[PDB]
Design a protein around this ligand. Structure first.
Ligand SMILES: CCCCNS(=O)(=O)c1ccccc1
Ligand code: NA
Length: 116
């Protein structure tokens, strides 16, 4: 559901976050197909990009209002619903907190969790 207008705003941060964490495009494709494992090269990439968009703080606490405001109008109720279930985040470190969030979301509402 991501508009075009994100992808070029995000390009620099996507490239940086991939480089920093060893992330491949194939891993991103895999998450978008609902396949995610607790591998830092992908979990830290998701934290990296959330942080770039100001959607998480230094301990992976989610700014739910900012997150909702980037979703299309017809995804927002369902997104707010799943986030009521899946927040607050918890885990061993920032990457594992986002792994746990992604898992919770994909199990409960699997149109919501898309990774650029
Ligand atoms: C709800 C999905 C969050 C994880 N994906 S994302 O960081 O690429 C992103 C995509 C679109 C809007 C905001 C963040
Ligand atoms: Na890894």
């Amino acid at each position: 559901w991501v508009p075009p207008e994100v992808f070029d705003l995000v390009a620099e941060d996507k490239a940086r976050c991939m480089s920093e964490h060893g992330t491949t495009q194939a891993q991103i494709d895999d998450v978008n197909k609902g396949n995610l494992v607790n591998e830092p090269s992908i979990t830290c990439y998701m934290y990296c990009l959330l942080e770039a968009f100001s959607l998480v703080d230094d301990e992976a606490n989610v700014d739910e209002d900012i997150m909702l405001g980037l979703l299309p109008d017809q995804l927002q109720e369902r997104a707010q619903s799943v986030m009521g279930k899946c927040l607050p985040t918890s885990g061993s470190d920032n990457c594992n907190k986002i792994y746990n969030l992604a898992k919770c979301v994909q199990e409960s509402a699997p149109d919501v969790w898309f990774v650029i």
